[PDB]
Symmetry: D2
Subunit: 428 residues, 4 copies
């Protein structure tokens, strides 16, 4: 089997997307711009596990353009875009992913990306940990062949840190999830753009003059609050951390407990990443037709079960849009059944945010692979200079003119003209 796609007749339609997305993903394109000749990953056989979408497709072809051997599989049974997957398979790349697979076909798709024409994979590019996990639990033999790993998710990195603590980790990893260019875009800037896209696409509701309660003031809460605020809404924040809470207050946001906020909000967004954010006692207080959605942790922040078990009626207005009737006589509009609203009611993050996240993947791959004896078994952070690098790949499209430190100023600041410009503890 060369690959397994739903319909390869879709390839021609996928390429169209790829060539449009490319213009919005400068990181990946500049990667090809400076390395496609040097082929830094020449020799590597990257087994990738990442949702197969137009953006991910652009990444793969970049990995390939840098001289790498690549085998791909999605990291979610549905997340994969078929015309994008088809174009890859059709590109002569082995991809095993179709939208809506079985937990059984999924594990198989992955198993396929482990062995190449010249042998087994020597590098991992994971989003979620499944790839890295499957190898460790079932293919420990191959382990000694993989030069390094690449993780871009909290979950993925958490388990990575866990395995390591258990001496389980045998191949060194690079945590690209905590890069500022990755995090800021994945969390802050991304949700800032798509949050309202979801709410509007599901309700077409006016945001101005409304009270929006955003639970949590982390990067996502920050982007969501900012987003809503720009539309004319009165954002109220809830938090458990004193520092994030203070950050919000300092910005003009009222900070209360959900127990109080629930009686005031017209729109509710959870950014927590923790359980029991919006409960039944809150729903009973919410104004009529309050919109409740979640953009943090998949479906565990809102108590949907309660809505299902206590509402007098429930009518699906449209896909990912339900409107419950409470015994108190008030209606509650729920979005995406409590799952991520930006992905469930919108198209998720814009390509540009993807460009930063993925370029980090390329950055990691190029480094691990290129520096064989540099990283001991363990989950490391992406060297700052590399993080700074993915940032610079986007300046330009943004049409930003970066100034260069003179030898004099560099010496004054006691730092390299190109070398990292900030300490590791620096929080931008």
């Amino acid at each position: 089997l060369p690959y397994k796609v739903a319909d390869i007749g879709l390839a021609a339609w996928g390429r169209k997307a790829l060539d449009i997305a490319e213009n919005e993903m400068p990181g990946l394109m500049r990667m090809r711009e400076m390395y496609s000749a040097s082929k830094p990953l020449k020799g590597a056989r990257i087994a990738g596990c990442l949702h197969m979408t137009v953006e991910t497709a652009v990444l793969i072809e970049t990995l390939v353009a840098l001289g790498a051997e690549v085998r791909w599989s999605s990291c979610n049974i549905f997340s994969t875009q078929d015309h994008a997957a088809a174009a890859i398979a059709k590109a002569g790349i082995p991809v095993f992913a179709w939208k809506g697979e079985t937990d059984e076909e999924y594990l198989w798709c992955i198993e396929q990306t482990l062995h190449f024409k010249d042998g087994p994979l020597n590098m991992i590019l994971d989003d979620g940990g499944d790839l890295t996990n499957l190898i460790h639990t079932k293919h420990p033999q191959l382990l000694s062949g993989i030069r390094g790993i690449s993780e871009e998710t909290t979950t993925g990195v958490h388990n990575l840190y866990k395995m390591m603590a258990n001496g389980i980790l045998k191949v060194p990893a690079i945590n690209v999830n905590d890069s500022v260019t990755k995090s800021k875009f994945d969390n802050l800037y991304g949700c800032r753009e798509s949050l309202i896209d979801g709410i509007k696409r599901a309700t077409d509701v006016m945001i101005a003059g409304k009270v929006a309660v955003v639970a949590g003031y982390g990067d996502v809460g920050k982007g969501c609050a900012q987003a809503l605020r720009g539309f004319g809404a009165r954002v109220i924040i809830t938090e458990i951390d004193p520092i994030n809470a203070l950050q919000a207050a300092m910005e003009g946001y009222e900070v209360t407990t959900m127990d109080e906020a629930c009686k005031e909000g017209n729109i509710f967004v959870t950014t927590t990443g923790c359980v029991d954010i919006i409960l039944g006692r809150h729903f009973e207080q919410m104004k009529d037709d309050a919109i409740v959605c979640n953009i943090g942790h998949f479906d565990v922040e809102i108590d949907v079960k309660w809505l299902n078990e206590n509402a007098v009626e429930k009518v699906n207005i449209k896909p990912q849009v339900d409107r419950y009737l409470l015994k108190n006589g008030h209606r509650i509009i729920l979005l995406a059944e409590g799952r991520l609203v930006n992905l469930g009611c919108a198209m998720g993050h814009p390509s540009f945010v993807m460009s930063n996240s993925f370029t980090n993947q390329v950055m990691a791959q190029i480094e691990l692979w290129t520096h064989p004896d540099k990283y001991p078994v363990g989950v490391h952070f992406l060297p700052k200079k590399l993080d700074e690098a993915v940032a610079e790949a986007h300046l330009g499209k943004l049409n930003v003119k970066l100034t260069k430190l003179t030898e004099k100023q560099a010496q004054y600041l006691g730092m390299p003209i190109n070398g990292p410009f900030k300490p590791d503890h620096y929080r931008y």
Copy 2:
């Protein structure tokens, strides 16, 4: 013929919409709250010409709930929503409108709303002027029967002022288009919400870090500029009026000529309402894949013909999304073929903005009809106290607590406790 709808089997699905929109249209609901008993329009036979949509539907039932006899027809061959029209016809109301009619069936639908069981229409509720025009040019006999007119559009009002200047106007009108609650919502607040809805639905493009050039700084340009600015874009304004231009400068926006701005922008929005805004000489300078859309005057602001006649390729990416290839090698993404992007790539204005516009209609109808000898033939402005009134109908849903002037303060300010609080020349 009782009515003419595409499919009355749609009624049940329309009602659902109506009952959802109602919650977002307080003006109309409060109208019923205080007048449905007094039936202020009791005796009137309103012939209405307004796109038949869920929002317009809610309005009609409010006119009816106030004791009026109503006959309806859309004011655009396509604008009419059928499940919303069906529910009206099914409600026992005579509506003549289906999406996609012929210029012939359109004139007929209108002709139908002129005669009631008890005689001909005695009142007009028009959006566009067609109704008022058709009567004047073809049914002058009825003219002496209509107590008054209601116009809510510039076009509609312009022609009204014109007819009057020609002594053609025989029935007094009330220009509700220039009410601040009507205008601010229809122009400022509405486009502020939907502009980005359009661009995102068509391109799913990241707005932050992009240069947006908004041509014109009127109410629409103001809303569009504010909207984009909140997303992280660098808005550059163009203008012909020194006062609007100054207004923009005072707010931090750079103001230049399109001739220069064209070489800098990534997104282009026209708010002008005038011709020749974006020409071929501009396209030839725009960056690769610049997005160009219009939200002002229907399709006359951008030079689409040129794109059609000078591009090397043209490919429809999706409905209302075309991507031209210029001889210079750059691509230009055009939205809604130069027509309104919020209506052509999104769902138009939210119900709340509709609630303000329509409540003005109800306000006008109630006044003209209720004051037989108050208004001489001529296009008048909606009394300020009525404009203030539609505003108050929305405070509350907005959860705004308006304070009341004491008799002392009222005497001090030399104004009524409820009477108008500002002079006519006041610009909020």
Copy 3:
């Protein structure tokens, strides 16, 4: 007597100020740029009554540079800046104004500006109405000699409208107070800049994280709210007008009654222009050390008498800064004794706002005087094209590049290439 200044030895120090202010007052400078040669006011003998300050000084010399004969007096016993008045007197111009005059010397100063070497004044440039009043009540003989009046204040214009209603008005006036370039700057933009200057200069208090209650959402409330909001404060608005209240809600501001807001705010600003805004019942609820100031109507919005009559202690922290101790144990910091905080705790409005207000004066003077039989006795509004004109005098320093309508677009828009670009009813 040639003039009456406190100390003419101050002249050299005044000129320094004048030459610095000039750079920030383009309107007056462009006036001289295009009219100092044509001398449009050649022949006029302007009797002016306007606080004698550096800005006003720049204006006078502009009136003079345009070929006019000018005699000046301040319109407030203290508002006059002496080094600015001295430089004028020293410039060979007759000015009768010193800071801190007696209600007796004030009336005399004014009486002096009525007669010139070539006869009595034939034009009035008033700010307050005193000049125009004094002539009407005591010098009716001169009345027939004055070609026109210029008023730039509400008070002034109110009385102007009153006199007219009583057939008292004998010389036509031009209400420049309602120009958008005058109003927006005097009210909106000015207070936006100076409000915080006052609070900071009096308290040096951090604004971020604080709740600021702004009473009134008119032009001043708008600027004050915007100002505070930008500093990170949570602004709560109070209003009696539904339209202004809605405008605030649509912008994300909570709107309540002072009765409730008083228990929440940390800073209080009155923008009302009406009495009994902050009363004793409010003070008793205010948080400890709440800052209360007024920027609307001079000292009638806050109930200071109550503070004086009910506080347990009162200690003057510094000029224009008092801190009362209430029986409840809470302290209340009052600013400028309830009088205007921006003038009383800061330097008032920046020169640029003055430039717009004054250029209006020049604009009015040039028009009335130049068009002898154009204006019938009555208070008229400044022609829009003139209002637009003062706006354009500032574009440039702002470095704004206004685009010019082509003959084609002008015809399309049905408006002049330079002629007014908007209808009188237009509210920018």
Copy 4:
């Protein structure tokens, strides 16, 4: 000698200040609220070297209220406020500081805080390093007596890291300068408030409609850019770091080089902290009367010498306000002679920012002293839980209602209900 103050007759006036500042410094007040009874610092003899001001005064009395023995001296010859210093000395506390001391009396003032009635100091609270340095270079004998150090400045901490690298450091330190509550307030929030206070107090210039060029987008540049933006200016950023540069672009700011920006700006702010930011080649291009000031590193960012050596004229407009005339005919307004504008043209940071910085000091002192064998010789970071703690001391005055994690959620999140809520690598 018990202490050395300029004038102890000033004490009574100092106390007034102290009791006003206290209300704006909750951190210090809550410190006393919970520890004044337990006297956590009971036994310590703190030798402090910190500018003696009203704020610092409040801190000292807090250290004393916690059961500590304290001896104080300023860390700048002028920074010390005398009425604040007098009230401390008068309070029975030994303070050696007066505004305007000699580099000789300064070293002596410090020497005084080294020995107590019960022996030498056993703890250091330093701002700058002088204290810690003086002991190391001249009093190594005492070294073994000090349980720990507290540094809150970059300079101070830099040297600390340096000494340590040279094995010189003998007593462990705690870098409180890098706490987020310290840094965010000292750098971001503080300068955001005072920047404009400076410019306005020196020039009283309108900010709106002006182009402000902020060099550097670090914490200060962020606050300064945000500040100016809120006033209506068009902020242009310059940067050497790609990440900060991208951060700015993503927020709507144009990013260029000073070499280009210089030809556009009206106001110039340096936030760099590096040399040669604004040079003569820039001045020669700046618009007429451009305002140039520095708020970053004391006087090394702007090339003042050049202005001095190349201007045709130089006239001091007022203290800390000079206006040079260049050979090109343009004038350049310089603020605070290139030194910090917020301190030199304004009153510096508001008390609240001081409250966060100082509470960090108290936090450090309480920890080091209370945990004798917890910290090995070396510069450590303030435990996150302590940083979170100083944050919570201010929630409340801000009237923020922090929610508490349930045992369930805490277990889910795998974190303590009160324990730190974020990893060390977390950048808020």
